[PDB]
Structure formats: structure tokens, C-alpha cells
Design a protein around this nucleic acid. Structure first.
Ligand SMILES: [Zn+2]
Ligand SMILES: [Zn+2]
Lengths: 78, 1103, 65
DNA sequence: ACTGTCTGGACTGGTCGGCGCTATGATC
DNA sequence: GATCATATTGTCCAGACAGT
């Protein structure tokens, strides 16, 4: 499974903590267990034994939006 | 030792151009095609098996004889290009291929039978002009300065423009942003057939394979299994061994695990190709599709099918690495991945198609002869049986026709074009022209724009305007195109140098892959050492200069590329080692003395040809004084990066790029003594300058090119000044006395042809003055210039619609028709010459060349060499023109507003240089980056007694007073263009109309009208002019009256014999009304009725 | 193809002295001094004489009749 | 109810000039 | 020789459609 490591500096711009980030996928993804180890995000499988379903669920985490609105990319202030 | 001078490099470049020339690519490609291309095609076809039991005919050696022509009587005589042009004959030579019949497996006596006529390139090895001196070419009616390299088909010169295509059998990888996928494509070539094999990876991680004549992309794993590999492990290491690549492959075959055997994948392929078919039919269809479409360049036998899977694997890696960031996306416009199909390759493909059709025709002929006569007549004389079953013309009419209309087999079109004969520059530009297969209307931002690999290969400025911009380019002056060499020798040399074969050692991350012409051949431990050894051997003359070696050393992948194929545009560069160029003063002295040639310099490795792939590893120095220890090459001539017409511009670095492009484009439209044999030529249109002049400010390359011997313009004393507003908006003012003195005087020649064609039943045309009793008599005064043989006398003044050749035609289905050849209604002149000869069928042919004196007048287009163009605004008398204090009256006056707006400082520099050259008597060099400096020119102008700026004190020609401003007057080379107002004025009131739409005809030759397009109608609507629009579109173009039935709206029929109008669909002999409308609307109604649509016209009262 | 009779700017006759100028140029002398001694002082006439190239000899070889 | 895919259509106007093509394998 | 039936069947944008 994916062991996600994120840079803190980008987290300094999104304005939210890592643990709350976990709260954005615990309820949404009830088929997987999400754990936080400092600045590293580690997921745990409930019942996963095939590589086919890993590639059908790893991209759903990435496509999930933690905060904001869908379809929003860059943002600048003038 | 001195660091050399650009003059020595210019001498070396001049020697290079003297040894090779400017049409070397066409001549070399045609020589390669003649020497082995015909033999390669013949060996590829091999033999013909007709429907005869236990008998076959195999093909032997094929040769080509001298260019000869057989007349209608039957006399075979040597053929010359001038005779072919005059008599409308194709300059071709017979092809003799020996045929060896095989009876019961025993070879018989060979039979040498002509299989057709192949057109001969001018000044080629198979041409009669090869090796002839200037006097010999003069005695044959040929210009010694003519470069050749073109074909004469039906008396018209045809030039094959090179085609900038993708590299064959090379995989190019790119990413589609809209599709969010990584796509790799290869154009595999086999016997003139091109197959686009595609491997893609979508967002789901699966790999799809696109095969032609297949409607849907199928999975990569399915083709990989059907290609010969059975187990999953075979596909696993058929691609690579990198763990990421292995894991991607594991995911791929896990997703595609539903099919495990070859038969199921073949069944899927056949079902997708041909749905609703029996299983075995789909199986054989899929097998044939895989054999003849899936990478045909690897072969067609199933034995190499497994190897095709290997070629699939090298594709998958290329897809995978770009999908994982290991490698970057290669540039599609990079010239390392681009090849240049020359005339030789296209001729080989056309000859292959024609020979295949000839082979099938001969097979049908022998089958028919055996079925009719039987075995007794067939085998009693096998020499005569094979010869009589051959129709050579069937081949010939396929070749020359493709060289006539420009249409090539396989959908390629525009390959052969009419050679431009406007002047000396246009023909060279057309002979050094490269086109692209991309559509002209398509916006190709990444393809039309200039590329960094075009340095030394493609001219950066000389490009056409409009939709042809970017897609049509010209070869650079230093551009060199490779000639084919046997690849087996190169592969053997590479293997013996220390390259481990691919089948012996698997690729490794720590090993350098070796590629030969885009095909991986193995791996080596030290790629850099191998590249250095190959370069040293090439510099030592051990191997040919065609082989080019490059090394790509990235942090992830390492590769070595060796290229020895055709279509690679290269440039010569001086090898620099340890900061010292290999070219010394001794080599320059030997070149100047004639003891050393350019090929000698190439032999010792002092100067080497580099393509785009090798130059990636090179660090070139622009100037001989800028060489350092890290520099690897030295530029020979920085001014040689421009094309032949682009070098005509003096000081192109001082002008804007669009201005330089316009000047290069208009250099081909100028008028001058292009050819010394213009009077004997039979060109349909031509121009001659009475007093052509070589420019005083000319680049040194123009002397080597040959523009000085064949100038196309005159030097004009131009003063930049506003004169009564008649030079406004790019216009120019010319001197009346200068025009009357012969300045810019031109003559326009037009050639008309008349053939005494023979029809069926013995009917034929007759060359005689038509009798007034016959119909179609134009008039008594129209034949006043005809002789008793129906031919016009030379040196006879003619006008519009004047009869030149009196011809009478047999009547259709009565008296003989009139088909006399007449001058154009808007054209006139004096008959220059009359030529009487015969065509290929023995019929009489009369060509009349008529010349018209073109004195410059208002509307005549004159252009400078820096893109400054305009028409004559006023013919000002000399007494009214201003004059300087030195007593100089300008021959031209240009507006001062156009000079700074277009950023044209090169025109001012050229004016200063022309004045300096005229005052000193020494020609001023205007070569790019090595020309005479502007400040030096101003210095000598000051030393000559004139102002530094070139301004002179001028007096008004009318008032006689001194002008308050010093006017800038200098000598600028101004050329007259072929866009004269005499051939551009059109005026139609009423005349002929089209037989279909009852509308005015097209163009000016047939007295056509002027098109009032959709935009004109729109702006007339916007103006609110309803009646003006009615008068224009309806009352003046196709006004007509029809009869309409009020009961049903159908078009009523009017019978003149009965004298009554009635509706046939309905009856209604009373309620019929006349409606005025356009004939185009009636045609539209007829089209709708033909399309099973009924338009019912509901008539309404006008009030 | 042949030298113009008069200068295009002022009508000064130059065809008479062109062949002498061409002969002196082929002898290695400076064309400026040759023009100076021949009376060709204005640079327009010098333009006409210098920029002209003889080409009629290459046209006479192609007979037309 | 969304989402990627298959299918269909258009790609500024005008002008000058040229080149070239629009049958054939049986039958008496 | 002179005739004669036959002569094969490139991109981008928008609307409609199986699939989940
Ligand atoms: Zn009716
Ligand atoms: Zn003068």
C-alpha cells in the first residue's frame, strides 16, 4: 500500500494539520485504515490481497479533495 | 600561427560548391536509384508465375540505355533535352530487363526485352549531357549554367520537391495532454507500403496497440501473446528488467489475464477486424493482418514474428519511461528524427508500383496466350512467347503520368511540380525545395515555426507566405544530404569493433545500447570509447563519411546511435582538437592552387559532415577567433546558413526578419537574363530584361552561385523623399527619361501550340487559312498575318484574338470546323518565332512564340532586395525631378515613411555601399556577417568628397529652389517583378457564360467576369442597397424567366411547337405565371428535384 | 545583354568607352582610375558602366532564324 | 444521474498564371 | 485488320450513446 510522505512547507500554505487530513479520508474511505506517523501518512488494508484492487483504490485517495471546491486549481490574490 | 581569416573559409566553401554544386541531392539520389534501385525492385519482385503448369519466368539484371526516341515511322534516334522540350517529348531512356524462362526447373536462354521507358534526370549519369563541357552544351542548345536535376515530361520541365517525412522504422514518443496518455508511433516501411504502428498507455495504466485496417485499439498483451510468446514470463523479460517496468508489466498481464493462448488473441483480432464471420475465417484474416501490417519492416514471414515482439518491447519501454519520467519526450520536428525523401526514393516507389502492375499484366497475357493457343505454341519458342506477352507502355504511362500530374501512388500528391523559369534564382530555389505532408490549412504551431536544428540545413528566412509558410522550406547553402550505403557492411564493422550482439548479451542499466538506423543491435561496455573510435576511424578515412555517430548520456538511460541511411541533411564543420582547428593554411593554399579538392579535405577528416543527431554532442564555434579548448567544431561559413535566394539580400542582419523573408521570396519573381538560350526555348511564359545588371552591393556567394552571370535586376539611383504624395503607401516614383532610356525595360514572351491531331476514321486537322464560307469565321482581317500554309509570318504585329495558326477541324456528327489558335484578347505583341516539328505520334506541331515590349508604366511592381516593394505611382519627367549639387538625378523616388516603420536599415546600408562602389569603381561586398562594415563605408564616402550619412543637397525640379533638408540619395538594387499591370488588367462587360450555371466564365484568358462573393453580398446588405444587390447578383449574372403553375408550385413546361404553357404534373393550362429569378435558383430547384425533394413555389402578386 | 548607349540618369553616352574600360579592367588596373581617365565622373554613369555585364555573346550562339 | 466514447462537420475570401487527365480485352 | 458491351463496391468542437 502507499506510504505517503508530504513536504511540510506545502502544508504551511494549505493551512491545515496532517491529523485533520486523516479525518478527510477516514469517513470517506471506510474500507481502509488511515494512520499518521509524524509527517508520514501510512494506510492499512482491511481485506486486500490482490494487486488489481490496489490500483482501483490508490487513485481514489489522490482524486479525493481534502478541502476547498472541486475543479479549482491555481489561486492568486491581487 | 595565425588563427585564420574568414576569407580562407570562404575559399574552402567556394571549393565545396564548385566540386558538388547546388542540385547534388537530386543527381546523387537519381544515380543511386539507377545504379541499384531498379535492381533492388526487380530482385524484390523476383519472378512471375502465370497459369501455366510447371513453368515460371524469373527476372535477371536490368539495365538502362542511352536516351533515345522512336518516331512514328519506326526510326530510333538519339534524344536531346532541347528536342524533347521543343517537340513535347518525354526525355526518357529504354529499360532492358533480361528474362530467364524456367521449364520443368531447368533454366532457359535469357531473353532481353524492353519493359518500358524511364524518364531521365537532367545532367545525371544516364543523361546525354553528363561530362559535356560548356561548348558541347552550347552546341546542343543547352545553357551551360543550367544545373539540371529535373525531368522533362511531354516537353514540360518537372522538378521533384523533396519531402520532409518522419524517420522510417523509428519510434517517436509524445504525450497527448487532452487524452492524458503517452503515445508512441512508428511508420514501418516495406516495399513502398507504410504502416503506422502505435502503442499507447491511457490513465488506467493499460497498454493499447493500434494497427492499421483495424477499427479498434486492442490490448498490448493480446498482440504480445499472439506474436509468439506463450507464458507470462516471456512477455515479462521481452521488454526490460527494471523493477518498475517489471511491475507495470505485471499489472498489464494481470489486467489482461483473461486470454492465455495465442488462438484466443488471434480470434479477438479477427473478430474485431471482421465481425460476424466464421472462426477459421477470422483466424486466417487475423494471421494475414498480423503478418502484413504489424511492423512490416521486420518482415512478413511468421518466423520473424517473435522478433516483432522484441520490437514491441522496445516500444513499450519508450511508452513506459515517458510515463514514469525516466526519459523525456523527443521532438517530432527535430531533424534527427526527420528524413528527406528525395527524387530517388519516390522514383523507386513509382517504379515498383509500375513494375508490379506490368508483372501482373504480363502474367495475365501469358495466361491468356496459354489458354488460347495451348501448350504446343507456348513451348515451341519460349523466347518469343515471353517477349510477345509484354506491353512496355503499360509501365511507361504509369511512370511519366505520375511525373506529369504530380500524383504519386499511396495518396501522396504534389510530388512533381512545374519547374519555375521566371529567372535564375527561382529554378535553383525550386530544385532545392522541401515540402511537408501536413495540410496547409492546419495551424501547425510546433511544425511551421523555425527549429534550432535547421541551422545549416534549412534556410531560416526564405519561406513562402500564407498557408504555405513553415511547411515549405528551402535547403541551406551548406546543406548536404546523405547517399545510401550497404548497411550490412556497417553492421559487420560495428560488430567487429567490439559491440556485443543483442542476442548474446541482454541490455543492462550499466551498458550502452547501440542503435543502427533506429534499430537496436546490441550493447557495449564503454559507449564513449566506441563513439570516439568510430569518429577517429571516420576522420582517418577508414569508413565512409555517411556514417554518423552520436552518444546520449543521461543519468537514467545511455544510448549510442549510428546513422547511415538516406534523407539525413548534414552540414560541414571543421574538426577542432585541443582548441586548434584541423584546417590549416597549407590546406587553404592547396585548395587555392587546385592540388586539394573538397573531397580530399573530407578524406583526411579535417572537415566532417554532421547531421542533427551527431551535432547534439558537438560544440561549434561561430568564428575562427572564438575557438577554445572545450570547442569541438568550427563553423565554416555563418553566411551559408541562408538559402540561395536569401543570400541575394545584402546585409540581411540589418533588416527585419519579415523583410528578409519578403526579399528572399521576391528574388524569384524578378526579371532578367536567366538563361542564355531563352530565344530557342519554348516556355509558355517568359520574361527578359533588356539591360540586366549585377548589383554593386552583392554577397560573395552570388558570384559562386551564378547570379552575377545571370542577373535579374538593375541598379537604381534612389532618393528617399516625399514627392507630391505619389510615392505614398509603398508606391515609387520613376523617372520618365530613365524609362525612355531603356532602364528596367522588359520583354514578355508567350508560346502557343497547335497540333494537327488525327481522329478516328482517318479524320485529321489541316493547317490552312480557313475559307469564309465555313462556319466559325472570326473575320477577314484576323487571318491577314497568315501565310499560304496557315502559319503566321515571323516579326508580324498581332493584337487580341489574332489568328496565329490556321487550323480546320472535321465537323461533329456539314463544313469543317474552325479551331485556329489565336492570341489572348487582352494580349498583343510581335511574333518572335515559329517552329514546325512533329509530336510523338507523328502529327504536325507548330509552336509560335510572340514577344511584347513591356515599357514600365503605372502599376508595374518594383521591389528592392530588402522586402521594399510597390507599384509605380507617377512617371515624372526629368525636368520635374530633383537633382543634387553633384548633378545626379535619381532614377527612383521612395517614400521616407516606409524605411523606419519596417525597420529596414539594410536598404540604407546598401544605398551607401552602392554609392561608394560607383564612386570608387570597386564592388562592395554585402555578404552576411563578413561584409564590409557600415562605418567603413561611411568613412570612404567621406573620403570621396560626399557626406557620411549619404545625404545630398538637392534642388526642387519645379520651383528650382534649394530643399531645406539634405536628401538621402544612393544606389539601391531594384528589380522589376513579373506582376505587371499589362497582364493583370481585366475588364468584362458582357461575353461568354458557363454552360451549367449561365454565369460568367473563370479567369481572364476566356474573358471571364469578376466574382461577387459572399462577403461582397454581406457588405452590400450592410450598406442597405437592396436594388444595387438585385442588379449585381441577379440582373447582371443569371437573370432568367420561368413558368410556374399556381395550383401545385411545380415548374410549368412551355412548348414552342404547340405554342402553349402547361403544367405536366398537374394540368392547369390556365393558371400559369411567369416568374423572373436567377438561373442558379432554377439549377438549385432541379438539384432538389433530383434529390427527391419537391419545392412548391407559392406565387404572390407583385403589388 | 549589350551595353546601353546612354546613361539611364543623364543620357551621357557610355557604350563607346565601355569596351576600352572592360579591356583596361582585365589588364589589372583599378577600374576607378579607368573611369576617371575616360571622363566618367558622375557615379550614375559609373553605375551604368560598372554594373553592366556582357551577355550577348552567349545569346548569339543559339541560332533562331 | 455522471463519464468516457463514437460519430459527424468545418477548416478567411478574391485574383494572376501554368500542367494535366478523364478505355479496354474479346469478336469475325 | 475494324467493332463492342462493360468498366469494383489531421484538430477541435458538438451531439448522441453504452457503462457505472
Ligand atoms: Zn400544376
Ligand atoms: Zn549619368
Amino acid at each position: 500500500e502507499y506510504v505517503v510522505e508530504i513536504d511540510p512547507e506545502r502544508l504551511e500554505k494549505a493551512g491545515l494539520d496532517m491529523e485533520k487530513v486523516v479525518r478527510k479520508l477516514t469517513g470517506s474511505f471506510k474500507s481502509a485504515e488511515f494512520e499518521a506517523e509524524g509527517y508520514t501518512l501510512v494506510v492499512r488494508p482491511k481485506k486486500v490481497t490482490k494487486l488489481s484492487d490496489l490500483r482501483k483504490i490508490a487513485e481514489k485517495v489522490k482524486k479525493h479533495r481534502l478541502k476547498g471546491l472541486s475543479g479549482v486549481g491555481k489561486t492568486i490574490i491581487r | 600561427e595565425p588563427t585564420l581569416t574568414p576569407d580562407e573559409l570562404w575559399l574552402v566553401m567556394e571549393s565545396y560548391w564548385k566540386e558538388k554544386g547546388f542540385v547534388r541531392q537530386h543527381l546523387d539520389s537519381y544515380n543511386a536509384f539507377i545504379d541499384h534501385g531498379l535492381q533492388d525492385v526487380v530482385n524484390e519482385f523476383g519472378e512471375v508465375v502465370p497459369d501455366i503448369p510447371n513453368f515460371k519466368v524469373k527476372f535477371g539484371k536490368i539495365r538502362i540505355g542511352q536516351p533515345e526516341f522512336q518516331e512514328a515511322q519506326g526510326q530510333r534516334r538519339p534524344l536531346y533535352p532541347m528536342d524533347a522540350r521543343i517537340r513535347n517529348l518525354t526525355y526518357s531512356a529504354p529499360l532492358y530487363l533480361e528474362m530467364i524462362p524456367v521449364v520443368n526447373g531447368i533454366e532457359q536462354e535469357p531473353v532481353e526485352v524492353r519493359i518500358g521507358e524511364l524518364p531521365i534526370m537532367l545532367k545525371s549519369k544516364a543523361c546525354r549531357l553528363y561530362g559535356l563541357s560548356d561548348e558541347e552544351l552550347i552546341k546542343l542548345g543547352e545553357d551551360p549554367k543550367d544545373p539540371g536535376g529535373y525531368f522533362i515530361i511531354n516537353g514540360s520541365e518537372r522538378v521533384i520537391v523533396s519531402i520532409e517525412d518522419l524517420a522510417p522504422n523509428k519510434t517517436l514518443v509524445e504525450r497527448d495532454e487532452r487524452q492524458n496518455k503517452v503515445v508512441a508511433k512508428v511508420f514501418s516501411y516495406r516495399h513502398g507500403y507504410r504502416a503506422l504502428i502505435t502503442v499507447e498507455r491511457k490513465k488506467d495504466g493499460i497498454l493499447y496497440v493500434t494497427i492499421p485496417n483495424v477499427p479498434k485499439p486492442v490490448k498490448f498483451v493480446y498482440v504480445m501473446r499472439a506474436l509468439g510468446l506463450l507464458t507470462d514470463k516471456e512477455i515479462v523479460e521481452a521488454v526490460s528488467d527494471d523493477p518498475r517496468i517489471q511491475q507495470v508489466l505485471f499489472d498489464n498481464l494481470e489486467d489482461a489475464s483473461d486470454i492465455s493462448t495465442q488462438e484466443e488473441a488471434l480470434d479477438y483480432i479477427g473478430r474485431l477486424a471482421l465481425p460476424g464471420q466464421p472462426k477459421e475465417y477470422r483466424l486466417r484474416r487475423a494471421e494475414h493482418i498480423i503478418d502484413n501490417n504489424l511492423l512490416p519492416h521486420m518482415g512478413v514471414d511468421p518466423e520473424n514474428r517473435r522478433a516483432k515482439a522484441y520490437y514491441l518491447g522496445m516500444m513499450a519501454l519508450k511508452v513506459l519511461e515517458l510515463s514514469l519520467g525516466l526519459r523525456g519526450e523527443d521532438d517530432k520536428d527535430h531533424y534527427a528524427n526527420k528524413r528527406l525523401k528525395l527524387a530517388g526514393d519516390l522514383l523507386k516507389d513509382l517504379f515498383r508500383v509500375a513494375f508490379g502492375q506490368l508483372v501482373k499484366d504480363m502474367q495475365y497475357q501469358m495466361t491468356k496466350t496459354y489458354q488460347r493457343k495451348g501448350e504446343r505454341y507456348t513451348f515451341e519458342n519460349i523466347q518469343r512467347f515471353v517477349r510477345n506477352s509484354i506491353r512496355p507502355d503499360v509501365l511507361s504511362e504509369r511512370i511519366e503520368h505520375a511525373l506529369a500530374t504530380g500524383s504519386w501512388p499511396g495518396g501522396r500528391t504534389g510530388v512533381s511540380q512545374l519547374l519555375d523559369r521566371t529567372n535564375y534564382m527561382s529554378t535553383l530555389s525550386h530544385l532545392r525545395r522541401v515540402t511537408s505532408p501536413l495540410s496547409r490549412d492546419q495551424p501547425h504551431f510546433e511544425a511551421r515555426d523555425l527549429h534550432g536544428t535547421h541551422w545549416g540545413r534549412i534556410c531560416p528566412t526564405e519561406t513562402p507566405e500564407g498557408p504555405n509558410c513553415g511547411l515549405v522550406k528551402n535547403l541551406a547553402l551548406m546543406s548536404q544530404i546523405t547517399t545510401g550505403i550497404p548497411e550490412r557492411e556497417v553492421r559487420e564493422y560495428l560488430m567487429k569493433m567490439g559491440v556485443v550482439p543483442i542476442e548474446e548479451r541482454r541490455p543492462a542499466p550499466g551498458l550502452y545500447r547501440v542503435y543502427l538506423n533506429g534499430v537496436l543491435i546490441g550493447t557495449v561496455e564503454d559507449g564513449r570509447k566506441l563513439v570516439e573510435r568510430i569518429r577517429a576511424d571516420r576522420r582517418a578515412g577508414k569508413i565512409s563519411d555517411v556514417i554518423n555517430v552520436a552518444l546520449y548520456e543521461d543519468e537514467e538511460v545511455k544510448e549510442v546511435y549510428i546513422n547511415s541511411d538516406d534523407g539525413r541533411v548534414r552540414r560541414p564543420l571543421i574538426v577542432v582538437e585541443n582548441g586548434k582547428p584541423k584546417l590549416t593554411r597549407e590546406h587553404v593554399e592547396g585548395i587555392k592552387n587546385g592540388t586539394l579538392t573538397w573531397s580530399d579535405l573530407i578524406r583526411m577528416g579535417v572537415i566532417e559532415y554532421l547531421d542533427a543527431e551527431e551535432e547534439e554532442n558537438a560544440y561549434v564555434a561561430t568564428w575562427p577567433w572564438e575557438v577554445t579548448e572545450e570547442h569541438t567544431h568550427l563553423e565554416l561559413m555563418p553566411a551559408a546558413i541562408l538559402g540561395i535566394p536569401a543570400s541575394l539580400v545584402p546585409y540581411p542582419e540589418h533588416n527585419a526578419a519579415p523583410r528578409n523573408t519578403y526579399g528572399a521570396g521576391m528574388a524569384k519573381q524578378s526579371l532578367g537574363l536567366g538563361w542564355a538560350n531563352f530565344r530557342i526555348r519554348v516556355d509558355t511564359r517568359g520574361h527578359l530584361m533588356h539591360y540586366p545588371q549585377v548589383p554593386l552591393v552583392n554577397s560573395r556567394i552570388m558570384k559562386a552561385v551564378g547570379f552575377e552571370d545571370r542577373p535579374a535586376g538593375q541598379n537604381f539611383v534612389v532618393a528617399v523623399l516625399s514627392y507630391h504624395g505619389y510615392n505614398m503607401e509603398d508606391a515609387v516614383i520613376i523617372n520618365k527619361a530613365s524609362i525612355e532610356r531603356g532602364l528596367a525595360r522588359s520583354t514578355f514572351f508567350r508560346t502557343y501550340e497547335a497540333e494537327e491531331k488525327r481522329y478516328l476514321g482517318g479524320q485529321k486537322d489541316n493547317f490552312e487559312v480557313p475559307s469564309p464560307n465555313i462556319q466559325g469565321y472570326l473575320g477577314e482581317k484576323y487571318y491577314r498575318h497568315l501565310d499560304e500554309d496557315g502559319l503566321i509570318f515571323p516579326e508580324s504585329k498581332v493584337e487580341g484574338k489574332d489568328v496565329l495558326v490556321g487550323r480546320t477541324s472535321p465537323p461533329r456528327f456539314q463544313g469543317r470546323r474552325e479551331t485556329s489558335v489565336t492570341v489572348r484578347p487582352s494580349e498583343k505583341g510581335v511574333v518572335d518565332k515559329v517552329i514546325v516539328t512533329e509530336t510523338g505520334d507523328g502529327t504536325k506541331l507548330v509552336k509560335v512564340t510572340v514577344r511584347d515590349l513591356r515599357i514600365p508604366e503605372l502599376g508595374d511592381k518594383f521591389a528592392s532586395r530588402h522586402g521594399q516593394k510597390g507599384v509605380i505611382g507617377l512617371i515624372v519627367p526629368q525636368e520635374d525631378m530633383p537633382w543634387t549639387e553633384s548633378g545626379i538625378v535619381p532614377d527612383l523616388i521612395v517614400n521616407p515613411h516606409g524605411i523606419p516603420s519596417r525597420m529596414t536599415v539594410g536598404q540604407l546600408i546598401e544605398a551607401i555601399g552602392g554609392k561608394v562602389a560607383s564612386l570608387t569603381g570597386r564592388r562592395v561586398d554585402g555578404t552576411a556577417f563578413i561584409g564590409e562594415p557600415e562605418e567603413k563605408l561611411r568613412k570612404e564616402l567621406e573620403e570621396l568628397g560626399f557626406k557620411h550619412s549619404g545625404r545630398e543637397i538637392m534642388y526642387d525640379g519645379i520651383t528650382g529652389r534649394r530643399l531645406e533638408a539634405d536628401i538621402f540619395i544612393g544606389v539601391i538594387y531594384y528589380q522589376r517583378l513579373h506582376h505587371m499591370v499589362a497582364d493583370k488588367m481585366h475588364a468584362r462587360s458582357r461575353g461568354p457564360v458557363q454552360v451549367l450555371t449561365k454565369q460568367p466564365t473563370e479567369g481572364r484568358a476566356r474573358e471571364g467576369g469578376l466574382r461577387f462573393g459572399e462577403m461582397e453580398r454581406d457588405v452590400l446588405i450592410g450598406h442597405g442597397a437592396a436594388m444595387l444587390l438585385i442588379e449585381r447578383l441577379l440582373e447582371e449574372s443569371d437573370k432568367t424567366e420561368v413558368w410556374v403553375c399556381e395550383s401545385c408550385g411545380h415548374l410549368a413546361l412551355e412548348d414552342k411547337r404547340r405554342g402553349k404553357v402547361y403544367c405536366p404534373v398537374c394540368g392547369e393550362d390556365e393558371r400559369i405565371s411567369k416568374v423572373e429569378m436567377s438561373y442558379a435558383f432554377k439549377l438549385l430547384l432541379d438539384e432538389l428535384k433530383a434529390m427527391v425533394i419537391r419545392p412548391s413555389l407559392r406565387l404572390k402578386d407583385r403589388v | 545583354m549589350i551595353v546601353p548607349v546612354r546613361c539611364f540618369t543623364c543620357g551621357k553616352v557610355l557604350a563607346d568607352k565601355y569596351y576600352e574600360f572592360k579591356k583596361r579592367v582585365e589588364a589589372g588596373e583599378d577600374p576607378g582610375k579607368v573611369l576617371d581617365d575616360l571622363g566618367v565622373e558622375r557615379y550614375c554613369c559609373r553605375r551604368t558602366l560598372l554594373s553592366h555585364v556582357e551577355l550577348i555573346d552567349q545569346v548569339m550562339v543559339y541560332k533562331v532564324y
